[PDB]
Amino acid sequence: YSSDLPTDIPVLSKRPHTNLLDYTFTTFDKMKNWARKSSFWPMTFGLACCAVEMMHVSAPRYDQDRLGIIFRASPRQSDIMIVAGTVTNKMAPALRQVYDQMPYPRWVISMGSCANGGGYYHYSYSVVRGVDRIVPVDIYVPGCPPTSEALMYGVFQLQKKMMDGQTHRMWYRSY
Amino acid sequence: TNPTAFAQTTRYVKDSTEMRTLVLNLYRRYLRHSRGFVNNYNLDIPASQVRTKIRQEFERQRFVKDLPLKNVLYMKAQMEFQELVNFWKQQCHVMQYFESIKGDSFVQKFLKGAQ
Amino acid sequence: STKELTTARIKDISKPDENNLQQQAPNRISPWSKSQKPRAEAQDNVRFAVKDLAKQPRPYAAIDLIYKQPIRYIEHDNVAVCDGNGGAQGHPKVYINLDQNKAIPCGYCGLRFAQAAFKEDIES
Amino acid sequence: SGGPVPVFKKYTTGSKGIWEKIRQLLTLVPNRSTGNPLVKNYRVPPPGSQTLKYKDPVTIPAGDIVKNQYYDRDHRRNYPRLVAFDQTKV
Amino acid sequence: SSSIQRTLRNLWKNGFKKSFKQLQGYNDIKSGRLVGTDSFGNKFYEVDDPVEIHMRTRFVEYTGFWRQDMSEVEPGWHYWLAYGTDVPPNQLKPEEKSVRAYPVKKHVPNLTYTDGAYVPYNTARPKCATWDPKVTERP
Amino acid sequence: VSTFPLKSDINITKSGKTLLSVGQGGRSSRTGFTATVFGGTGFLGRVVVSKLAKHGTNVVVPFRNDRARRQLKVNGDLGVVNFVEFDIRNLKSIEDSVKYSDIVINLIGTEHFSKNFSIEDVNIGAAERIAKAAKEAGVSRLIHVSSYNANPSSSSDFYATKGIGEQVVRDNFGPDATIVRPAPMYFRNSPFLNELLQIKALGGNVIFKKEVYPVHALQVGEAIERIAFDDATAGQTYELFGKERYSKKELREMIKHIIHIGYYPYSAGFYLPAPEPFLYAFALIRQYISSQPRFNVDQLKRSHINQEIDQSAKTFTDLGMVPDELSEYLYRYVKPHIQNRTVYSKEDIEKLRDYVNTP
Amino acid sequence: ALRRYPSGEERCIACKLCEAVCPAQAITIEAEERIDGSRRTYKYDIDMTKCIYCGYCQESCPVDAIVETPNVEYATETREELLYNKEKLLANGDKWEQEIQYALDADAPYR
Amino acid sequence: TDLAKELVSGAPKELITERVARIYQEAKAATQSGQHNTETWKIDWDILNKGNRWENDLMGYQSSSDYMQGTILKFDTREGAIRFAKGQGWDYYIQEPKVRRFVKKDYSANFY
Amino acid sequence: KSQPYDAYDKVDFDIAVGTKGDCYDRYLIRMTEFRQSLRIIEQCCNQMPPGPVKVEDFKVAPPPRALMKEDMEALIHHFLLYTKGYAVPAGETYTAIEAPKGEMAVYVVSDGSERPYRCKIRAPGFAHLGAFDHIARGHFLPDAVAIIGTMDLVFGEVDR
Ligand SMILES: NC(=O)C1=CN([C@@H]2O[C@H](COP(=O)(O)OP(=O)(O)OC[C@H]3O[C@@H](n4cnc5c(N)ncnc54)[C@H](OP(=O)(O)O)[C@@H]3O)[C@@H](O)[C@H]2O)C=CC1
Ligand SMILES: CCCCCCCCCCCC(=O)OC[C@H](COP(=O)(O)OCC[N+](C)(C)C)OC(=O)CCCCCCCCCCC
Ligand code: SF4
Ligand code: SF4
Ligand code: SF4
Ligand SMILES: [Zn+2]
């Protein structure tokens, strides 16, 4: 057949706004992403000492709730999975099952050295060397344990990424 | 404190014949729950193969002679049953148990690095 | 070229350029160890396909910097004492013998010490 | 002893003036502190801006240049030997 | 520190546009004496208000409006902001400044989620060097 | 899978590259290669990327859907799976997708068209531009994927563009380009086993008379592995399919019993017979009203065409692999949609086939 | 962060002490004689996903070449970015040299 | 001892079929004159003909698939090592340590 | 009190003993242990002595950095302490303290080397969780939540 395929169309994250229908779908993206960024409800998946710093983020001094962050005890009501602690072999299948039960859109944060890459227990017979061998991880928070501000920097970094999403402008342009 | 379901006391047997009665009894107990093993674990194979592979593992130890080896292999024999009944293992473990699978020529192993 | 960019030399040949991203360091072209991987070969990799090489870490090569220091010259003594110019925040105190007609560098700092009487020959 | 202490004797921020009298009239226990530390007292010279020049402490017998032979104070090598009493020695 | 009087006084001292920015990113209306600006452009203030609570006597005003990144605070001021030092890095004694023998450029924030994210690589050459083959012909 | 995807640890490409593998073939091992799976976020790409990264082969995955690519990384170790944002209307991105690669795979394709791309631009324009750029980037091997009835003379648009797509690849890359023509691939969350399980299938009698041959998606994924790692497959065309002949009308009914779904199937809308001139009309309307890919006009013509086997091409016996029959794999892919659990073996499924055709 | 002398030479003399203390074995050091004879390291990695942030390497360094800067806000999108090689650590030592001096001056006598 | 104790240890079959252990007593190091590390008997496993060590492509690490590379056992009698090796059914081979031959050394010998 | 350790014999403090063995008694005892801690903490603030904080034995404690960089023997000991370690005379021990959870103890076996031969850790929570079945027998689901909290089960210690 005939296909007049250009070569100079910029990729989606680079494409400037030209017509009105770009802004219409961009606005639907901002309003949708702003709500998801602001209602940042994680899932209480604290496993070990990394969870103690997770609770301190919700303490009065830092007060995660002031930013719209409410820890939820169920995957159905949660969209963020925070892996805070060591992922053992015995815990690994349960972590995958809990991850699969979260409705989209979902993001996973890896907190501390155990979740990231094993940490102190990297050469153990019962520890998974990085939770990214079981679930996809969207951002890695470093430390043992990461300070409460280090965890909030990880959450703030992810929100900046969620606000950069173009789920609906992608349909209008990339699709 | 009370023991959990399908538990048994741990006694070191001293007679060879006594053990085989326990060994044979335990075998049907594996066989009896085979359909439930499929149902509870949602196995993709009919219960016939589940009964099939249980029998093979018993024979693997058939020819032990010394008694102290006989008990420990029976003590651990019961434990694997008890965990299987009570749904303690996850579906991933049981699938991988029954999902397991001629050696290459000398040139072939040599060609790919061998061992 | 790829001739200087892939072999270590005591001193370079051409003047280094800070904008050239293929240099081993912004202030030195060739590597300064025999087993140091050249930076040109290091970045010729798939993981750099969609990166911005200007923003990768490029610390200034310390070999070129340390030879920009003047030689300390000791007066009427053949032994220099060096401690990193920080005392408790420097290296352990090491005594350097300057009998030989050359500048003996310090084991830790890399500062070069000599005798004043030997300066004229050294500066030739 | 651990008897109750007047509120103005605790290092926390406390009200002054008309609000102090309101605070005493309405609180259940008037000598309970708000818990917010005094800004002018708590950590005011931060740990990184102190004035004390630290000096390594050394007790004399074990830090002296004299009368300080190491074998006198080498306790790690004077550990009690392990002796087991069998029936025969009893 | 929560009464509307504390917000009224800070609102009047700053003026609208300065306070509107704090009403957009800070969520609180504060006013303080300016201490210095860092290489990225952030300005660091100190609060003299007698009612401000213990850990809230210093703060920042980031350069951007809709976004803030904590990695944008220059390292010198990152320590002062956290109540780690009493001397701001613009009041340093010349016998306490760091001596850098290399040019210092503009501060670079955390580059993750961009193309400037650091890429690790091996800095060592391979440990075996294969033979450079040559053919020689018999007499 | 197994324990080592190669037959040798040294593999020289058409371009003089000597690739030496290290390790036993597990996660920490490497093969020295570097593939580029296009459309790796697609149904077939995910299995193909998984197998390559499982054995330490670096895989560049060009993507456009930012979230859909995240789950690809779990398959590979650190630094193995790499992500390059791209668009087939952008050339620079594709010239970076294949820059460092040693194998190029092209799974991009469509049976539907959109407001920004037609079937002509995707099945023909994209594959051509990939092969042209993959050739100029010094890639030793290219593997291409097309439909099962690639025939440039077909009145259907899908097989019209898929057939021409084969030519423009070999006319761009050269006479070394391998070609794979898989049959309808069935797997978990497969587009084929989906519409067979969908309850309210409008126009069922029109759509399900089409006859095909089932084929395992994993075997297609494993077949693509053998093709890339073997240099004797260059320039060869593969027609991948199964042995036993199955018709969707047979499957849609054999499935019906496994799902266990009297009055309800008629009331629930499981059967929605339709006059064809209406289906051509409703599917016409949803092309410009629906924002999602609906069962369109071109797909309707395909329902009038049974699968054709181009007997001049090769099969699984060339690869020394036994094709897997849908009898043993139909059940485990309908358990998501499914006393004692009713388990169907190979014998149970074949007997269930007899009942459907018995009046 | 890996530090420098005021003269600019790297502080580390590739002594490999920090590698031997490190409880988690997060450090990989490869060294040899430099081009001009100095005892320098050409490869130096810290697996920041394996370090337990314990400060032993800092205590054991005889020349204060390896320290821990007060930075905590460096969370990364990918885990590859948490494998700090010698280029990365020396770039941190330059970035945070002023703040390292803040802490070293204050807590020098206590060590 | 005589029992096939390996059937209860749960160790992989490959330690019996595919690996070779070594019973040896560590030799005195040339650099140092201490003689204490050479008084306990040790067991170590042979390396693998391939996959013992290979360079990680990304960071240049030392990857390995040998799960016995960092396993060294200690004993105080030679027999206990051999008995333990026999109990596990290991395919071992013993390395007899060399014995230094006595030579009397006299200060006066420098002239006589 | 049974084996006073680390200046716990110098300060004066009381202990609280229950009588009903229920959750309310353990709640009261802990709230008393708060105020007894605040009673010790003040004394340690007033009785703090000057002097070294570690053993004046450079063969088990690293020398100060200033002395390390100026005195040869300090550099030797600093070197061998951070690479070889310090040797512990052979034997074994069982040291228990009054941890906040309960009695925590370690059974360390030494071999004359620089690495422990064995280290068993006796976590109070591990012994408590065994008694959970013996206590929860005859209680309701909202009552189980109380019993877990009254046991103080941090599962790092239980699953050491
Ligand atoms: N049972 C089956 O699936 C059968 C399929 N085939 C053919 O195999 C090929 C692979 O399809 P399959 O993986 O199975 O399922 P999909 O149809 O979901 O795969 C389509 C792939 O091509 C990409 N694609 C489509 N349009 C574009 C575009 N403008 N730009 C970039 N990428 C695009 C898609 O990217 P994205 O996902 O981001 O949209 C996707 O990865 C298809 O051509 C199909 O016709 C042949 C026989 C059986
Ligand atoms: C039925 C539903 C009812 C409406 C629901 C309400 C949804 C809440 C609104 C979301 C807001 C939001 O998201 O605002 C913040 C976002 C995200 O900003 P950013 O991510 O930094 O990028 C944006 C900034 N740039 C691109 C320059 C970096 O946009 C903005 O900054 C919008 C900036 C322009 C706003 C113009 C508004 C015009 C007036 C509108 C009212 C008279
Ligand atoms: S990373 Fe450190 S703090 Fe976090 S769970 Fe592991 S050991 Fe605990
Ligand atoms: S701080 Fe980290 S790198 Fe340093 S010794 Fe401790 S674990 Fe190792
Ligand atoms: S301890 Fe210091 S000098 Fe020694 S190797 Fe480590 S960083 Fe280098
Ligand atoms: Zn010096």
Q: What does the H/E/C string look like for I32-68?
A: HHHHHHHHHHHHHHHCCCCCCCCCCCCCCCCCCHHHH
Phi/psi for A118 (5° steps) reads 95, -45
* CB-CB contact of F170 with F129 (8 Å): no
Phi-psi region of A102 (alpha: psi -120 to 50; beta: other; left: phi over 0): beta
Q: Separation of E64 CA from ligand 2 center, angstroms? A: 15
> Considering every ligand atom, which ligand is closest to the CA of G89?
5
- Across the C:F interface, residue pairs with CB atoms under 8 Å apart total 19
Q: Distance between alpha carbon A1 and the CA centroid of its chain, in Å?
A: 44
In whole angstroms, give the CA distance from residue E89 to residue G98: 8
User: CA of I25, closest CA in chain B: separation in Å?
Assistant: 23
CA dist A89 and E60 (Å) reads 45
Contacts of F78 in chain H (CB under 8 A): 58-59
Per the CB < 8 A criterion, the answer to whether C92 and C108 are in contact is yes
Interface test mutation site (partner A, options F87, F159, F291, max chain A beta carbons within 10 A): F87
CA-based end-to-end distance of chain H: 57
Q: Measure A25 CA to ligand 2 centroid, in angstroms.
A: 13
Q: How far is CA G81 from CA C47, C53, F130, G46, G57, in A?
A: 12, 15, 31, 11, 21
Q: Is the bond preceding A145 in cis, omega lying within 30 degrees of 0?
A: yes
CA F61 to CA F34: how far, in whole Å? 11
Radius of gyration of chain F (CA): 21
- Strand bridging mode C104-105 / F141-145: unpaired
In sequence order, the 6+-apart residues with CB closer than 8 A to the CB of C22 are: C5, C39, C40, C43
Q: What one-character-per-residue DSSP string does A22-81 give?
A: HHHHHHHHHHHHHHHHHS--EE--B-STHHHHHHHHTSTTT-GGGGT---BSSSTT--EE
Residue with tokens 């020396």: G90
Tokens 């001293």, located at residue: B14
The gap from C-alpha F322 to its chain's centroid, in whole angstroms, comes to 19
Q: Please give the C-alpha separations between residue E18 and each of C87, E24, E25, F231, I115, in angstroms, as whole numbers.
A: 48, 10, 11, 68, 61
Q: Which of I43, I54, I57 to mutate to test the interface with D (most CBs of D within 10 A)?
A: I57
Return the number of CB contacts < 8 Å for C and G. 84
User: Does residue F223 contact residue F320 with C-beta atoms inside 8 Å?
Assistant: no
Which residues on chain D are in Cβ contact (under 8 Å) with E53?
Answer: 13, 36, 39
Q: How far apart are CA F83 and CA F60, in angstroms?
A: 6
Give which of F333, F335, F339 is closest to B35, Cα–Cα: F339
CB of A19 within 8 Å of a chain F CB? The answer is no
Measured distance CA(E53)–CA(D12) in Å, rounded = 10
CB G104 within 8 A of CB C71: no
- Report how far Cα F169 is from the mean position of its chain's Cα atoms: 18
Q: F10: how many CB neighbours lie within 10 A of its CB?
A: 11
Q: Is A118 in the pocket of ligand 3 (CB under 6 A)?
A: no
Going by their DSSP bridges, the two strands H62-63 and H73-75 should be labelled as unpaired
Please tell me the total number of residues recorded for chain C in this structure. Answer: 124
> Which H/E stretch holds residue H63?
strand H62-63
Protein residue whose Cα sits closest to atom 16 of ligand 2: A30
Nearest to F345 by CA among F334, F358, F359, F332: F332
Residues in chain I: 160
Ligand 5 atom closest to the Cα of residue G16 is 5
**What's the rounded Cα separation, in Å, for the pair F186 and B4?**
44
Instruction: Decide: G54 in ligand 4 pocket, CB within 6 A.
Output: yes
Please report, for residues E16, E27, E45, the alpha-carbon distance to residue E10 in angstroms, rounded to integers and kept in the order given: 10, 13, 13
Nearest CA in chain D to I88: D76
Burial pattern G22-33, b for ≥16 Cβ within 10 A else e, equals bebebbbbbbbe
Contact E54 D46 (CB under 8 A): no
3-class state of residue H87 by DSSP: helix
Residues D23, D15 contacting (CB under 8 angstroms): yes
- The string of DSSP letters for G81-100 reads GGEE-HHHHHHHHHHTHHHH
Sort residue F117 into left (φ over 0), alpha (ψ -120 to 50) or beta: beta
DSSP-based three-state secondary structure for B67: helix
- F211 forms bridges with which residues in the sheet? F247
Q: Classify residue C65 by its DSSP letter.
A: H
What CA–CA distance (Å, rounded) separates I152 from I102? 9
- Residue-wise DSSP of chain I: --S--TTTTTS-------SS-SHHHHHHHHHHHHHHHHHHHHHHHHSPPPS-SS-S-TTTSPPPHHHHTT-HHHHHHHHHHHHT-----SEE--EEEE-SSSEEEEEEEE-SSSS-SEEEEE-HHHHHHHTHHHHHTT--HHHHHHHHHHHT--HHHHT-
Which of H6, H7, H14 to mutate to probe the B interface, most B CBs <10 Å? H7
Map residue B115 onto helix, strand or coil. Answer: coil
Q: How many CB atoms lie within 10 A of CB D54?
A: 11
Is any ligand 4 atom within 6 A of the Cβ of residue G27? yes
For ligand 4, mutation pick of G25, G29, G51 (most atoms within 8 Å of CB)? G51
Q: State whether E86 and D49 contact (CB < 8 Å).
A: yes
- Are the C-beta atoms of residues F203 and F274 closer than 8 Å to each other? yes
**Token duo for residue A58:** 């919700």
CA–CA gap between residue G96 and residue G102 (Å, rounded): 10
Q: Is G61 helix (H, G, I), strand (E, B) or coil?
A: coil
Angle formed by the axes of helices I141-151 and I23-46, nearest 10°: 20
- Nearest C-alpha neighbor of F182 from the set F267, F107, F115: F107
What residues have CB less than 8 Å from E57, skipping those under 6 apart? D39, E46, E47, E83
Nearest to E2 by CA among E26, E21, E25, E29: E29
Distance in angstroms (rounded) separating the CA atoms of residues I160 and A93: 20
* Tokens matching residue G14: 């590739």
3-state SS, residue F79: coil
Closest among A118, G13, A90, I69 to C62, alpha carbons compared: G13
Tell me how far apart the alpha carbons of residues I100 and G51 are, in angstroms, rounded to a whole number: 29
Edge-to-edge order in the sheet of strand C112-115? C72-74, C112-115, C104-105
Q: Do G111 and I82 touch (CB under 8 A)?
A: no
Taking 3-state DSSP, the helix, strand and coil percentages for chain A, each rounded to the nearest 5, stand at 45, 10, 45
Q: Three-state DSSP class for F213?
A: coil
Residue E44, phi then psi, degrees to nearest 5: -115, 125
Residues of A with CB under 8 A from a CB of E: 61, 66, 149, 153, 156-157, 160-161, 164
Cα angle F307, F313, F315 (rounded to 5 degrees) comes to 80
Provide the shortest C-alpha distance from residue E138 to chain A (in Å): 56
Handedness of CA I97, I99, I102, I108 (dihedral sign): negative
Spatial neighbors of C49 by CB under 8 A, at least 6 apart, are: F60, F82, F84, F96, F99, F100
Q: What is the per-residue DSSP string for chain E? A: --SHHHHHHHHHHH-HHHHHHIIIIISS----EEEEE-TT--EEEE---TT--GGGSEEEE-S-SS---GGGS-HHHHHHHTT--SS-TTS--TTTS---SS---------TTSS--------B--S------------
Paired residues of H94 in beta bridges: H23
Q: Exposure of E13 by Cβ count < 10 A (0-12 exposed, 13-18 middle, 19+ buried)?
A: middle
Per DSSP, the residues of chain D read ------GGGSSB----THHHHHHHHH-SSTT----PBPTTTTTSS-TTS----------HHHH-SSS--GGGS-GGGSPPP-----TTT-
Return the exposure string of F125-152: e unless at least 16 CB atoms fall within 10 Å of the residue's CB, then b.
Answer: bbbbbbbbbbbebebbbbbbbbbbbbbe
State the Cα–Cα distance between residues I74 and I63, nearest whole angstrom.
Answer: 6
Q: How far is E37 from E137, CA to CA, in rounded Å?
A: 75
Which H or E element spans position H92? Answer: strand H92-95
**Of all helices (H) and strands (E), which one includes residue C80?**
strand C79-82
Set of chain I residues whose Cβ sits within 8 Å of the Cβ of C83: 69
**Would you tell me how many other CB atoms lie within 10 Å of the CB of residue I155?**
14
Sequential DSSP letters for F124-182:
IIIHHHHHHHHHHTT-SEEEEE--TT--TT-SSHHHHHHHHHHHHHHTTT-TT-EEEEE
How many Cβ contacts (< 8 angstroms) between chains B and H? 24
Q: How far apart are CA I15 and CA I34, in angstroms?
A: 11
To test the pocket of ligand 3, the residue of A47, A86, A111 to mutate (highest count of ligand atoms within 8 Å of its CB) is A86
Measured between alpha carbons, how far is A3 from E80 in angstroms, rounded to an integer?
61
Is the Cβ–Cβ distance between F329 and F193 less than 8 Å? no
Residue reference for tokens 């007679």: B15
Resolution in Å, one decimal place: 3.3
CA distance E133 to C78: 53
Residue nearest atom 4 of ligand 3, based on CA coordinates:
A50
Q: In whole angstroms, how far apart are CA A147 and each of A51, C91, G62, H40?
A: 11, 32, 28, 46
A120 CB contacts (<8 Å, ≥6 apart)? A113, A114, A144, G23, G24, G52
Nearest to E44 by CA among E53, E55, E57, E28: E57
What the block records as the tokens of B46 is 């009919």
Q: How far is the CA of A145 from the centre of ligand 4 (A)?
A: 13
Query: Token digits for F255?
Result: 């499935």
Indicate the helix (H) or strand (E) that contains F219.
Answer: helix F217-229
CA–CA separation, A140 vs E110, rounded Å? 13
C82 strand-pairing partners: C94
User: CA H44 to CA H27: how far, in whole Å?
Assistant: 14
Cα distances (Å, whole numbers) of residue F256 to F184, F212, F250, F334 = 20, 19, 10, 10
Q: How far is CA F230 from CA B112, F130, F143, F280, in A?
A: 14, 21, 11, 45
- H43 Cα to chain F: minimum distance (Å): 25
Mutate to test the interface with A, among F46, F69, F74, F108 (most CBs of A within 10 A): F74
Please state whether the peptide bond connecting residue E89 to the residue before it is cis, i.e. omega within 30 degrees of 0.
Answer: no
What's the rounded Cα separation, in Å, for the pair E75 and E83? 13
Distances from the Cα of A119 to the Cα of A128, F93, G27, G48, H68, angstroms: 10, 37, 13, 9, 21
Inspect the structure and tell me whether chains C and I have 3 or more CB pairs less than 8 Å apart: yes
Q: How many CB atoms lie under 10 A from the CB of residue I80?
A: 14
Nearest Cα residue to F241 out of F181, F195, F196: F181
Q: Which of F36, F41, F43 to mutate to test the pocket of ligand 1 (most atoms within 8 A of CB)?
A: F43
What is the rounded distance in angstroms from the CA atom of residue C123 to the CA atom of residue C121? 5
* 3 state SS of F12: strand
Backbone φ, ψ for residue F27 (5° rounding): -65, -40
Q: Which helix (H) or strand (E) holds G105?
A: helix G97-107
Alpha-carbon distance of E104 to I124, in angstroms, equals 55
Torsion of CA F250, F253, F257, F261, to 10 degrees: 170
Q: Which residues are paired to C15 by β-bridges?
A: none
